[PDB]
Amino acid sequence: MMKIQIYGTGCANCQMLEKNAREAVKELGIDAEFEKIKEMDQILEAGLTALPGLAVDGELKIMGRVASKEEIKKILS
Structure with a gap:
């Protein structure tokens, strides 16, 4: 349900919020599809x-620092 894009993957520590986001986003009562965007062409296109x-x-x-598990729940709840 929730279209979540992760720009960076490599150097980008999104990996942390990546896992937390899937469970929280879906668990919160709305599934979300996380598709990575390994290419600035796509990164900048996002606006970050x-x-x-x-x-x-x-x-x-979120830019230059992926959110935290606690932040997600607090941002949505």
Whole structure:
């Protein structure tokens, strides 16, 4: 349900929030599909200015530092 994009993958520590996001996003009561975007062409297209950009449902709010598990629940709840 929730379209979540992870820009960076490699150097980008999105890996942490990546796992937390899947369980929380889906568990919160809405499944989410996490597709990685290994290419700045796609990264910048998102709108983020940092590497570890995270755009959900077409809205990026994480750049240069992926969110935390506790942050997700607090951001959504």
